[PDB]
């Protein structure tokens, strides 16, 4: 069973695109391959949300129990981190967590790099472009969510500290004198790192998928599959809690 | 010439050695802390999370510079 | 490019804003209600314990508020009876002291039965003397006068 | 694309591993949590249950206490009359006891009076027989009657 | 020239160096902590797992970059 | 001849190797200190933050030098 | 002019550097843990097994990369 | 022939690696000693200030070399 | 050309760095385990032999690849 | 050619890395010792002066040759 | 050219660092253990000798590679 | 060519991190020892100075070979 | 060609890096051992000396090989 | 402040070369190393006779200083061993004093600048003051005399057991015998390389960074280099005593 | 000019060395001299003083030798003070003999003198009686018979 | 020149060997002579207290002769106390006998010195006893002469 690639070759890794590709042309903004997946994740989230909240049973059960458990676990983590800002940032943090989690889980579906439209289709004149590209596999999505988080945390820091946060200290004129610009650039550059890692983890996961399918698509890729299914979940949660902790250190 | 490929290779290699022992001793210190005491687990786990986040931040900094060089 | 990022920014924000009032603040309010009601249940269990203790004290307080109600009215009844007899026993003593007074008031029949000077005693002494103590033959005048003066 | 079939084959195999490794433990944590909620709810409805009836029990008992207090004082009033009638009657038959003992003493007293009177005449009869016959012997027979007793041998 | 093959080799090796000793010190600290009172076995195992997930995530970064260059 | 590419690559990698292991040992020691004592959390958090800021300073020096060389 | 030779050599050396130090600290920490007390016995042996397997995975990654380059 | 670019790149990276681990172990020992005792905070912060001053002296030597690269 | 011999030299050096420190740290763990207590000698030396075999694996891999490259 | 500037940068960077960890280690040990017991402060301060003197002597060892290459 | 010379260079230089730190950590662990437990001297001596035998065996492999290129 | 200059730069520069972190940990061990034991001051000073001497001996070896290359 | 010079430079530098780390570790372990076990000093210093003699020989071999090439 | 402003004194001079000799007009031309060694011999003999010309209890002045340093060395040696603390004591004391004064001598004013001609001309201008420690011939000599002394005292009382740690047949002990034997065989080469390169590096440092800046710069560096000169002067005797102790054991 | 810069800097280094010179040397050298001086001088001074003082301490037996003569001198003093006392104290009883001597002889001076007169009076009465018996027989009792009728 | 420098250091060591050994002997001279320094210090103390001890059996040597000789002659005088105490008492005792025998003698002659008065007194009382003053047939003297005896 080791040499199944000789009988069935997966073909060369024809996917290498590191940017969003317009899957469908539109009169306005063309429909990119990642934005449609983002909308799919959005509607799936809305569907499960209304399904768990259609009855709103007092006693949690089934899917309602699952979502209640997840939400209370996250809420407990947040109250452990910060006290007076749990509900303030809870919605945005939880949304950006679960959305990218479901995007990562969607990234492993069959045909996410194989099924697609033509500009099997390589034989056709139109170039075989893939469908089901993750939103995190779009840099623009990562940039947007990172800057949204950054503007949220700086707005709330300004609300908390007034002109104190507005100047973020940096008035020591002593040991912390040259430091004020150091944390200034540090919090300037961190959301870039967040967006970059959001892109990179998913991009690496999918290229790993492609390369391990190319080498041996039988009994080899499975531990790696476990690797990305674990890393997507843990990375999504650490992004969420990192945003929360960034807010908690911005207020303080 | 392939010189850009060598650039990307060096960039990713040094970006990988960047946080290795870093995150290793992060979780090592965290596990010593939790073994000594699990009552303050939340406060310390938050800080080890932010530290490992910073390490991964630098690693992906190197990685995306490698990508920009490659394209 | 930059417009694609700006367009994607609204999509995530709209999803967060929509789900906030849809799921988020509803379900946590259910959890918020669940926590306080459980917290209230602990208070209710606390309230049950004190009320049962309060019920015991209130039961005992009225129980304590029972005997002294009867205890007092007995005491006035007790003294009212004892002063009545004290008046009566004094009155019973009083009338008894009257009774002995007539006994001395009717001790005077002695003074009227002793009015038997001629009947008995003048004849008594002569018989127990001249006829007894002394010889039957006694010769003297004034013996009746002699005895009578001693009688008075 | 032939990769999609391979992607489907690999993805399905992951679920097959997922259908046995973590399949049971995830519901193991799920069932205990919802059981923990409902038993806490069961505790909540249970604890709320005795609060009303114990309050009702208290209301019944505080009524019973009032019922107790009312019935306890209820027999006191006749006791406030029963011992009331006894003690006055106790003085009554005592009062007749005082009057009978006085008159019987008085009837004893008049017996004492006549006993004293019969002693009083016994007192007088001695002295009257004493002063009298003293002059009778003085006048005559002082030698004669003394000489008679000389012949009593 | 074959310099691109050299680039791939250096990239993959210099990616293996980071987590290669990373997971080593990870499990060293983990076994040290679990050697004292193995009551927090679940938590320490989970933290070890997430740390090693991060480390071989960096390793896969290196591997996939080396493979893309090997293309 | 993209010599600037290898320049920027080695720049970002060698400016990432330092701060990564730097913040690693920094907040590993911070974990040790907070585990052995949580009552001084404010001061030790301040000190770990200033230390990570100090090494991240060099991190962004490397990053900005790489960016300047790139363009 | 023979760049694949040095490619294979660098692949082998740089794929062996990581595990070469990682495995030692793995088994050394395991030995320390079982030496301060032998009660845990094979439970920690399982953890050192999985750690050494995880690093030898990177080792054989380097090995297979070198073999592919050589042929 | 842009050898100035690689020169200043290696200069900044290799002057960040040293003081990086410097700052790291500086504040690591500082926070460990603070956890040991808080009453010595002034002396230990002065000594760690001396240490970080030496690290940043090395760093600014590297930076001024990087600037003279452009001169 | 001569790249074969420099390849062999770099390969053997880079395959000697890892195993050397690995051997050192495992025998150090063994010697602390021994000094902690006797009657654990058998288990700790068996684990020491396990570590020495797993590092000899990398060592002999380097040796055989060097010999293959040199021929 | 400009290779002289490359030599200067390499020399100064290699002369900064060594002391860049040396100073941190010596004063971290010093602060650990002074946190253990703050009564031998003068002696340990003299000893850490000895250490910093030696390692900064190495630093200027690198720096003077970096300047000589510029000569 | 002088590729034999750089071959000798990498042979003698690279590959000594491995045992170079290995010997230090070996004998340091041994001396710490013998200070703690001076009564297990013979076993400690045997274990340190077998460890050094293996690590300088790894070193002597590079030594004889240098001899072979010496011819 | 200026390759002799980079030879001198490498020779003086490389050859320093070993002795650098050497004297680092030498003074670290000496200061922990003197903190734990005051009256063994003569012995610990002698041993720390001879160790520092050996490290700086290697450093001046590198420097003198650099000067031999330079002239 | 100064390729002989750069070869000798790299050889002596990389060889000199070899022992210094180990010898610092040696004296650190020995100084701790004499610290908390002041009774044993004659044996431990001899084992320190035999360890440093073992580890130095690689560095002396490297420098003397550079000298042989240097002539 | 106190700026340098010494552009006039910044003449280009970075010359250095280990090779060095005096006029050597007679046979075997003498070197500037082996006139500094002779002047160090003269100075140490003068100090020895000055301390010896008044020998009395309660030493004072120079006598107190020499007694203090001698007893310090004796105690430091006794801290290692006491059986041979006096067997090699004159040797190590003489070596330490000679290298101490030799490394001092290379730091005096005009050292390295007293050209023997044969400036402002094409003459060689060989510096008369060159430290013998910073010259290989003397350094190799002291290294090899230390070596011959150590194996002399080893085989003095070790029988055939001196060559028993090596060329054994115990297996692992036989394996390590070769490397240990090579280690002690190459130790004197290490002695020479240390005790040459240390002083040579110090003096070339002084030369080059005085060439950079003439005034107010090298004073902390002067302190650093005199301290390190002290260090190698003392460690040589220390390591020789330690080596002979481990040899006799 | 090469030696000029070396000369200027070397003097500055020596001048800076003089700052710590006194502390590093003067203080340390002074301690060495005093520590040795106080040890060698004072310890040897005591033994050398006590070397010849042993004869003086053998003469401290000799100062006890006149003290041996001393307490002996008070011993003879203590002897003679009581020896003279105990004689005179006993010689006090020697005259107590003489005090007794008259006291033990005074009674014989008076008892013997008073002794004789006691018996002579008795001898007088008895010698009278034999004469009285002779005189009464010669004179006769007839005349004395009339003397018996004086009051009868 | 390397071999030439080798002899110089060895010659320097051999030249310093006389310098070192003499200072070593000078140092050993400081090291020696101090073994006895603690010897005589303790040696003197034990003998100094022994001389102080020597004064102490001297103290009893007085004291043993003190009480013994004090009571020696005193008791030697005590025995001769009572020797003359009783001898004079016996002299006093025999003083009684020589006078008691004496006082009996002159009393006998006192009776003989009053012999005439004796009868002259006896006759007076006996005659008066026989009859007031003169007595009938008194024969006071003749009757006294009848048994005058002494």
From Swiss-Prot, chains B, E, F, G, H, I, J, K, L, M:
<dbReference type="InterPro" id="IPR002379">
    <property type="entry name" value="ATPase_proteolipid_c-like_dom"/>
</dbReference>
<dbReference type="GO" id="GO:0015986">
    <property type="term" value="P:proton motive force-driven ATP synthesis"/>
</dbReference>
<keyword id="KW-0138">CF(0)</keyword>
<keyword id="KW-0472">Membrane</keyword>
<dbReference type="InterPro" id="IPR020537">
    <property type="entry name" value="ATP_synth_F0_csu_DDCD_BS"/>
</dbReference>
<keyword id="KW-0406">Ion transport</keyword>
<keyword id="KW-0066">ATP synthesis</keyword>
<keyword id="KW-0813">Transport</keyword>
<keyword id="KW-0375">Hydrogen ion transport</keyword>
<dbReference type="GO" id="GO:0045259">
    <property type="term" value="C:proton-transporting ATP synthase complex"/>
</dbReference>
<feature type="transmembrane region" description="Helical">
    <location>
        <begin position="49"/>
        <end position="69"/>
    </location>
</feature>
<dbReference type="InterPro" id="IPR000454">
    <property type="entry name" value="ATP_synth_F0_csu"/>
</dbReference>
<keyword id="KW-0812">Transmembrane</keyword>
<dbReference type="GO" id="GO:0008289">
    <property type="term" value="F:lipid binding"/>
</dbReference>
<dbReference type="GO" id="GO:0046933">
    <property type="term" value="F:proton-transporting ATP synthase activity, rotational mechanism"/>
</dbReference>
<protein>
    <recommendedName>
        <fullName>ATP synthase subunit c</fullName>
    </recommendedName>
</protein>
<feature type="site" description="Reversibly protonated during proton transport">
    <location>
        <position position="56"/>
    </location>
</feature>
<dbReference type="GO" id="GO:0005886">
    <property type="term" value="C:plasma membrane"/>
</dbReference>
<keyword id="KW-1003">Cell membrane</keyword>
<dbReference type="InterPro" id="IPR035921">
    <property type="entry name" value="F/V-ATP_Csub_sf"/>
</dbReference>
<dbReference type="InterPro" id="IPR038662">
    <property type="entry name" value="ATP_synth_F0_csu_sf"/>
</dbReference>
<comment type="function">
    <text>F(1)F(0) ATP synthase produces ATP from ADP in the presence of a proton or sodium gradient. F-type ATPases consist of two structural domains, F(1) containing the extramembraneous catalytic core and F(0) containing the membrane proton channel, linked together by a central stalk and a peripheral stalk. During catalysis, ATP synthesis in the catalytic domain of F(1) is coupled via a rotary mechanism of the central stalk subunits to proton translocation.</text>
</comment>
From Swiss-Prot, chain D:
<protein>
    <recommendedName>
        <fullName>ATP synthase subunit b</fullName>
    </recommendedName>
</protein>
<dbReference type="Pfam" id="PF00430">
    <property type="entry name" value="ATP-synt_B"/>
</dbReference>
<keyword id="KW-0375">Hydrogen ion transport</keyword>
<dbReference type="InterPro" id="IPR002146">
    <property type="entry name" value="ATP_synth_b/b'su_bac/chlpt"/>
</dbReference>
<comment type="function">
    <text>F(1)F(0) ATP synthase produces ATP from ADP in the presence of a proton or sodium gradient. F-type ATPases consist of two structural domains, F(1) containing the extramembraneous catalytic core and F(0) containing the membrane proton channel, linked together by a central stalk and a peripheral stalk. During catalysis, ATP synthesis in the catalytic domain of F(1) is coupled via a rotary mechanism of the central stalk subunits to proton translocation.</text>
</comment>
<comment type="similarity">
    <text>Belongs to the ATPase B chain family.</text>
</comment>
<keyword id="KW-0138">CF(0)</keyword>
<feature type="transmembrane region" description="Helical">
    <location>
        <begin position="1"/>
        <end position="17"/>
    </location>
</feature>
<dbReference type="InterPro" id="IPR050059">
    <property type="entry name" value="ATP_synthase_B_chain"/>
</dbReference>
<keyword id="KW-0406">Ion transport</keyword>
<dbReference type="InterPro" id="IPR005864">
    <property type="entry name" value="ATP_synth_F0_bsu_bac"/>
</dbReference>
<comment type="function">
    <text>Component of the F(0) channel, it forms part of the peripheral stalk, linking F(1) to F(0).</text>
</comment>
<keyword id="KW-0472">Membrane</keyword>
<keyword id="KW-1003">Cell membrane</keyword>
<keyword id="KW-0066">ATP synthesis</keyword>
<dbReference type="GO" id="GO:0005886">
    <property type="term" value="C:plasma membrane"/>
</dbReference>
<dbReference type="InterPro" id="IPR028987">
    <property type="entry name" value="ATP_synth_B-like_membr_sf"/>
</dbReference>
<comment type="subunit">
    <text>F-type ATPases have 2 components, F(1) - the catalytic core - and F(0) - the membrane proton channel. F(1) has five subunits: alpha(3), beta(3), gamma(1), delta(1), epsilon(1). F(0) has four main subunits: a(1), b(2) and c(10-14). The alpha and beta chains form an alternating ring which encloses part of the gamma chain. F(1) is attached to F(0) by a central stalk formed by the gamma and epsilon chains, while a peripheral stalk is formed by the delta and b chains.</text>
</comment>
<keyword id="KW-1133">Transmembrane helix</keyword>
<dbReference type="GO" id="GO:0045259">
    <property type="term" value="C:proton-transporting ATP synthase complex"/>
</dbReference>
<keyword id="KW-0813">Transport</keyword>
<keyword id="KW-0812">Transmembrane</keyword>
């Amino acid at each position: 069973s080791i040499a199944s690639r000789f009988f069935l070759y997966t073909g060369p890794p024809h996917v290498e695109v590191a940017a969003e590709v317009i899957f469908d042309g539109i009169p306005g903004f063309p429909i990119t391959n990642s934005f449609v997946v983002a909308i799919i994740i959005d509607i799936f989230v809305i569907a499960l949300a209304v399904a768990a909240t259609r009855n709103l049973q007092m006693v949690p059960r089934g899917l309602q129990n699952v979502m209640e458990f997840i939400l209370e676990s996250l809420y407990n983590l947040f109250r452990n981190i910060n006290a007076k800002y749990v509900a303030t940032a809870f919605p945005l943090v939880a949304t950006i967590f679960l959305f990218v989690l479901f995007g990562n889980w969607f990234g492993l579906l069959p045909g996410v790099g194989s099924i697609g439209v033509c500009h099997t289709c390589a034989a056709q004149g139109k170039k075989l472009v893939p469908l089901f590209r993750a939103p995190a596999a779009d840099l623009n999505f990562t940039f947007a969510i990172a800057v949204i988080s950054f503007v949220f945390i700086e707005y709330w820091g300004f609300r908390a500290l007034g002109p104190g946060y507005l100047k973020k200290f940096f008035n020591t004129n002593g040991i912390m004198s040259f430091v004020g610009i150091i944390e200034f650039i540090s919090e300037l550059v961190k959301p870039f790192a967040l967006a970059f890692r959001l892109f990179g983890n998913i991009f690496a996961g999918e290229v790993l998928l492609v390369v391990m399918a190319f080498l041996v698509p039988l009994l080899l890729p499975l531990p790696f599959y476990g690797f990305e299914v674990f890393v997507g979940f843990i990375q999504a949660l650490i992004f969420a809690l990192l945003t929360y902790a960034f807010l908690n250190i911005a207020v303080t | 010439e392939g010189l850009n490929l060598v650039a990307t290779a060096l960039a990713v290699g040094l970006g990988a050695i960047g946080p290795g022992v870093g995150i290793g001793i992060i979780v090592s210190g965290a596990v010593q802390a939790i073994g000594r005491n699990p009552e303050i687990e939340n406060r310390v786990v938050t800080y080890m999370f932010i530290g490992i986040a910073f390490t991964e931040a630098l690693a992906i900094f190197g990685l995306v510079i490698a990508f920009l060089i490659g394209f | 490019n930059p417009t694609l990022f700006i367009a994607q920014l609204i999509n995530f924000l709209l999803l967060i804003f929509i789900l906030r009032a849809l799921l988020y603040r509803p379900v946590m309010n259910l959890l918020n209600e669940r926590t306080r009601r459980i917290e209230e249940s602990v208070r209710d269990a606390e309230k049950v314990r004190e009320q049962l203790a309060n019920a015991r004290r209130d039961y005992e307080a009225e129980i304590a508020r029972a005997r002294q109600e009867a205890a007092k009215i007995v005491a006035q009844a007790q003294e009212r009876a004892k002063q009545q007899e004290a008046e009566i026993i004094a009155q019973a003593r009083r009338e008894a002291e009257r009774l002995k007074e007539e006994a001395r008031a009717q001790a005077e029949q002695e003074r009227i039965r002793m009015l038997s000077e001629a009947k008995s005693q003048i004849a008594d002494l002569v018989t127990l003397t001249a006829s007894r103590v002394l010889g039957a033959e006694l010769q003297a005048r004034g013996h009746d006068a002699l005895i009578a003066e001693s009688l008075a």
